[PDB]
C-alpha cells in the first residue's frame, strides 16, 4: 500500500502552513514544490525535523521539478502573484495556472484539486481546462476563508464558540462576495432570534458583513508586509481533509454549476458537500429576490472575466 | 504549588469506566474513579493507567471507595444510582448522600448529573450539595440531541458536524425534538425538504426514533444500557467547563423565570464556559412547541414535589 | 470510486467495543463490528454511532452477526473466544472459522489476533486463513509492554512516554520483561539506580507485577478482564499499519531462523508499518536471557505440537 | 477561573509558529507581543479566524505594549537579532532580553519562562537575573530542537518512525553542542545492536552527528532568506505543554545547574525533568572521560561569555 500524497503547487507563507497542518494531522506524505530554488528544500527540513517533537513520522519534500507530484491524491495551488484589485492579474496567473494544469494532467491525473490562486473562480476554470481533469475534482477555496471569518466576528459578538456559529458566504471571491446574514444561525437558532434578546443589534451584524467583505485588506494593511496565512491555509487543509476521510462535509467553495441558481457552465462560490469524491453535490439555496440580485451580481463579474480572457489569446 | 485539574466520577459502571478514558486520552486531568463496591474501580483505574502508556501521556487515574478522595475536584460527574417509580426514593437518597459529600470535600466543583430521572435528580442533588445553581446541571439534552443528529445526519448522507439540531424539556418519553430548529449549516431543514433529500414523513419518524433511541439501544443490547455516547456527552459538557468553550448544549439548568418555569431544572439551551450555566438561551418557541414543553416539565413538578 | 478504510472486529465484547470507539475517535476508517450473538453488536454501534455526532466525525460504525460483511476489511483484529487447557480445543476450532472466512471475504488484509493462548491461536489462524504471514500477527508485547512501562514511569514519576521498555517471548506466565533494556529517553535504567532513583529490588518487583498485571486486574474487578490497554494495543497495532508508521513494537510474529526459531509465532520486537510485519528486531540477548526466551517458547512448541 | 494565559515576547516567524500550535492544540490565551508596531495584531486577527476553521474559541490579541502580558502563566521569548558567530550577538541581545525581564518581574512574575534567543545559555542567566524568578522557571530551548534533528536524521537512515529513537544533545546551544552517540537507542535498543546487525554504519553515526551540529546553517543557506522556525516552535512549545499538563518530560534544556556534573550556578544544556512547578529535575548522565571532556569544553565557552559580559557595565 501506499500513504495519500499530498503536494502544494506553491511554497509560500500559505503553502508551508498547508504543509505543517498536513504533517500535524498525518494526512499524508507532503510535496512543496516552488519555483524558487532550493527555499522549498529548505522548508521541508525544517518540516521533517518537526515530525520528531510531534512523535510522526511523515514524509516531507521540497523540490523545483513538477514531476516529484507523480501520483499525487491532493494538490493545493498558491503559485502566482498576490501583491484596481486582485482581479487585474487574470493574465499573468491564467498562464501560471495553465502551466500547472498541464503538469497536472501529465503528472497526476486523479488529484483532486484546489485552487486558491486569485481571481479565485476563473483560475478554477482555467486549471480545469487546462489539466481535462472532472469538474467535480477541481475547486477553488474561497468561501470556508470567508465564512471562518464571518463566523468568528459573530461568535465573538455574541461571546459563544466559532464551533456554534453557522454562518455562509456564496459568490466570488473578492467585495463581489455576498454573505448570507438570513442563514447566520447559533446552533441552528435563527440569529434573528439573538437580536431580539439584545444580544446583537441588526446595524452590529450589518457592520460586521462589511467587515468580512473587506477582512482580507483589513490584515494586510496590519501586517504590512504580505497578506494572511494562517486562515487561507486552515481553510484549504479542511476541505483537502473532508476528501481524504470522505467527511460529507458541507463547505461553501468554488464549484461548477450546470443549471443550479440560473448559472450553466461556470465555477462560483456556492454550498457542497465534498467527500471522498470530490465535489458530491452542491446545495441550491432558496435565496430571497434581493440575495439572488446580490449573487447574480458576481456571477456577471466571474463571466466577464472570462470573457476579458477569452480575448487574449 | 500548580495542580492539574481534578474530575471525579462518582460512579464507575459503563458511563464512569468509558468517561475516564476519555478524560485521559484528552489529557483533561486527574481523574478519581469512585464506586461503592470494593476493588473494581481500582481495577478499571489499573487497566486506564496501563492504556496511559499506550496513549504515550502521563494521566494520573486512580480508584476509590472513600469519598475524601473528591477532595479538589474541579468537575464531578455522577452516575451513582440503581415500577420505575419504584427506584426514585432509592435514588433520590443516594443523591442526597452524594451532595452531602460533594459539599464536604469539593464545594467549588462543576457538577454534572445523569443518574435518572434527570431532572428530578439533579434538582436533588443541587439541594443536598448547597452548590450555587450555576454550577450544578444534568446531562441529557446533548444525549438526545446527538442521537437526533446523528439520524438527520445519515439520511442527509451529510457529516453530522454539519447538522444542528436540539432537544429540549424534561428527559424520558415526553422530551421535545425541536424538528423546527434543525438546519444544515444553517440551512433551514425544510429547504432540503423541498429539495427532495428528505420528506417529514421521515423527519417525523426520526423525531420518535429520538425519543425512543436509549430502548431501542437496550432492546439489541440484550443486556445493559448505552454508554458510549452518554459517557461521551457529559465530557463534551466537561471539557466546555475546563477549557471555558462557550458551547451552546442543551443541558437540564436551573429556571428562574425563563420559558415561565421557576425553581426547576429542565433541558434547554445553555452556554457551558468556565463559571458554569453561563447563559440560558430563551427560544422563540411556537405555541405548539411551547405546549409540548409544558407538558414535558409537569411530570416532573410531580415527582419533585411528590419526593419533598 | 475512493473508499474509506474498512476495519473489521471478530469479537464485540469489552474489547472489541472498545476498540471500535477508539477507531471512531481517531477517524481510523469504517467499523465492522461482528459477534456470533444476535442484535449485541448492532446495538453496540448505534450506540457509537450516536457518540459520532458529540465528536463531530463521520465515522461509519455498523454491527453484523454474518463473516460477508467483513468482505475488502484492510485491517481485522479477533477478540473471538471463551483446566484452561480445556478451552484450548474449542479456540483452535473457532479461530479455523475465522481464518476461512478471512481467506474468502478479505484476503488483503492485516489480521491481528488477540484470543489467548495467543502464541498459539495466532499460529492457527495464519494456517486456516492462507494469508502471508507477515500480514497476520498476534496483540500480547505491546500490552505487556506498556503495563511494565507504567510501573517504571511511576516510580521514577516520569511520563510514560519516556520509558522505552520491552517483554517479548510468548505471552502467559513466562513472558519475558527485559529489565536490561529499559531506558528513560535513552539512558540506561541501571544510571538511576545508581542515582537513588529505583533500587534494583524495586525493578525485580516490577518484571514479576508485569508477569502477573492481568491476574491482578482481574482479581480487582470481581467480573471480567482487562479491556482499555488490550484494546489501545491492538489499536497501536492497526494504526501503525494504516498510516504506515514503522513503530517499533513487541508483537507476536512469524519467525523463520531468528533467535533459532522457525516455523512459529512468538513476541518479538518488530517494526510495523504498511506493508505489515516489515522487519524482525534480532535482539543481542544475553545468554541468561535467550535461556528465558527458549524456555518461553518450549510450552508453545508442545501445545502447536499437541493440537496438530 | 481562568485560562492558561501564553505570552509571546516576538512575534516574527517563530513566535507566529507557536501561536499557532498554542491556537490548535488549545492550551490557553495566546499574546503576541512585538516592538514592530501593527504587525502582531494582524497575525492575531488571522489567527483568530484560523480558530473558526478549527472549531475552537481560542483567544488571540496582538500588542505593542508589555503589560498585556500580566498574569502569563508562560512566556516564551525570540526577541532579539538573529541574523564570527551567534556568541557575538551576546552586547544587543542581553541588553533586550534585561528590557525583557524587568517586564516580566512587573507584570508576570509567577510564569515558566522559555528563552529562545541566543547565545542561548548566556540569555537565559541574564532573563533570570533582570526578572528575579525562581531559576527553576527561567530555562532555554535549545537541546529539543538540536535533538529532534538528531533523532529525525537517524530514524530516517534505519527507516523506523522519529518516536522510536532516543537521542540527546548537551552543552550549549552553536557548535559546541555535544550530541551523544553512545546513548542513542531505538526503543531502548543501543544503537550499537544496529551498527552489528549492518542497519547503520560508525561512519554514517559520525556524519549525522556533525549534520545535527551544522543543521541550523543546512536550513538558511537552502532557505536564502531567515532561518528554522517550524522545528524551533514546535520544540518550545512541547516545553510550554510539559510545563502546563504536568507531563514530567524528559527533556534536554537549559537549565540552572548547582554542583551537577560539576558546574556551578550556570546554565547549560542537560537533559531535565520539565513539569507543573518547572525545571523539577536534572539528570546526571554517567559521561565517559571523552564525553565529559567535550562537555566541559562547552561550559567553558559559557563561561567566557559570561565574564565577557560581566565586563561590559
Redesign the interface.
Given at each position: 500500500?501506499?500513504?495519500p500524497k499530498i503536494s502544494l503547487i506553491g511554497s509560500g507563507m500559505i503553502g508551508?502552513?498547508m504543509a505543517?497542518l498536513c504533517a500535524?494531522k498525518?494526512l499524508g506524505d507532503v510535496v512543496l514544490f516552488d519555483v524558487?530554488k532550493?527555499?522549498p528544500?529548505?522548508?521541508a527540513?525544517?518540516?521533517?525535523?518537526?515530525?520528531?517533537?510531534?512523535?510522526?513520522?511523515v514524509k516531507v519534500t521540497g523540490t523545483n521539478s513538477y514531476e516529484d507530484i507523480k501520483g499525487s491524491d491532493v494538490v493545493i495551488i498558491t503559485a502566482g502573484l498576490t501583491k484596481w484589485s486582485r482581479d487585474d492579474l487574470l493574465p499573468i496567473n491564467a498562464k501560471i495556472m495553465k502551466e500547472v494544469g498541464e503538469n497536472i494532467k501529465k503528472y497526476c491525473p486523479n488529484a483532486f484539486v484546489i485552487c486558491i490562486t486569485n481571481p479565485l473562480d476563473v483560475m478554477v476554470k482555467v486549471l480545469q481546462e487546462a489539466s481535462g481533469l472532472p469538474h467535480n475534482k477541481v475547486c477553488g477555496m474561497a468561501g470556508?476563508?470567508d465564512?471562518?471569518?464571518f463566523?468568528?466576528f459573530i461568535?465573538?459578538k455574541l461571546?459563544?464558540?466559532?464551533?456554534?456559529?453557522?454562518?455562509?458566504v456564496i459568490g466570488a471571491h473578492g467585495d463581489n462576495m455576498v454573505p448570507l446574514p438570513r442563514?447566520?444561525?447559533?446552533?441552528?437558532?435563527p440569529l434573528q432570534?439573538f437580536i431580539?434578546?439584545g444580544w446583537i443589534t441588526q446595524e452590529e451584524i450589518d457592520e460586521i458583513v462589511e467587515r468580512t467583505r473587506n477582512?482580507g485588506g483589513?490584515?494586510?494593511?496590519?501586517?504590512?508586509t504580505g497578506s494572511?496565512?494562517?486562515?487561507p491555509?486552515?481553510?484549504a487543509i479542511?476541505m483537502a481533509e473532508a476528501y481524504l476521510?470522505?467527511?460529507?462535509?458541507?463547505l461553501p467553495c468554488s464549484c461548477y454549476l450546470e443549471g443550479q441558481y440560473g448559472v450553466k457552465d461556470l465555477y462560483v462560490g456556492v454550498?457542497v458537500?465534498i467527500g471522498?469524491?470530490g465535489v458530491e453535490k452542491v446545495?441550491?439555496?432558496?435565496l430571497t429576490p434581493e440575495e439572488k440580485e446580490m449573487f447574480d451580481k458576481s456571477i456577471e463579474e466571474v463571466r466577464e472575466l472570462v470573457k476579458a480572457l477569452e480575448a487574449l489569446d
Open positions: 500500500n501506499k500513504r508551508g502552513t505543517y500535524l498525518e524558487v532550493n527555499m528544500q529548505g522548508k527540513l525544517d518540516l521533517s525535523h518537526s515530525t520528531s517533537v510531534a512523535d510522526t513520522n470556508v476563508l465564512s471562518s471569518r463566523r468568528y461568535a465573538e461571546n459563544v464558540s466559532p464551533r456554534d456559529v453557522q454562518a455562509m442563514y447566520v444561525t447559533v446552533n441552528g437558532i432570534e431580539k434578546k477582512a483589513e490584515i494586510v494593511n496590519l501586517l504590512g494572511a496565512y494562517f486562515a491555509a486552515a481553510s479542511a476521510k470522505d467527511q460529507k462535509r458541507v454550498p458537500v471522498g469524491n446545495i441550491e439555496l432558496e
